[PDB]
Amino acid sequence: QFEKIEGRMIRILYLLVKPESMSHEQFRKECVVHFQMSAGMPGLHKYEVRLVAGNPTDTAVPYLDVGRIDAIGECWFASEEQYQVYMESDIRKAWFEHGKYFIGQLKPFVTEELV
Amino acid sequence: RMIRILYLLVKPESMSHEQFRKECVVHFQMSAGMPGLHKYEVRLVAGNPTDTAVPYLDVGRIDAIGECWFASEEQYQVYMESDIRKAWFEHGKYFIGQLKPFVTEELV
Ligand SMILES: C[C@]1(CC(=O)O)C=CC(=O)O1
């Protein structure tokens, strides 16, 4: 039941691609640092970051090429007000500064729960 | 630990946005009690902010995000072998025009 309410929070999913010049070894270390920095982030209920480890191409339906994605990020916000506390935060600004260092390109999707 | 595969879904060009939304819901309903599957989730893409604080990545129009969780490699195989799983994928062919799978790895 906690997980159900959690699933219906404001959620933004991000595709990350590392800077061209950064090694994979360093990129993985900087994802870990980025997660450490999320702790106590004002307004944020939850953050998750994962590497892309596999890119299977034998899909039953036609395969969508979106190029090489290195990691997937996700943020959960418990309310419109909490999202605003985040979006106003200096601490978020400093998180994004680290983001500019280890994230070369970023695609965010704002998602909508169906159930 | 937990195997996770995240999917970018694009609807078929023969289908409306609203039809697609309805098929997403049906697809979730079909997944209940699927052999080998720990969890399935499907959400629409409702917003495409481009006002990013690092360089914006363009991957085209993604309509939905799907995701599967499997407890173990053994459960994943039970799932792959399952007849009802195969029928669920046939429903996938109906409402998913193009698919991108990502097999993920945890960092913390
Ligand atoms: C929310 C945020 C902050 C940032 O990009 O630095 C954006 C992507 C991500 O993984 O973390």
Ligand SMILES: C[C@]1(CC(=O)O)C=CC(=O)O1
């Ligand atoms: C869509 C979003 C959300 C956020 O601030 O994490 C806004 C800027 C950005 O880089 O990602």
Ligand SMILES: C[C@]1(CC(=O)O)C=CC(=O)O1
């Ligand atoms: C896991 C799956 C199964 C399918 O292809 O129907 C693939 C994407 C999706 O949303 O559901």
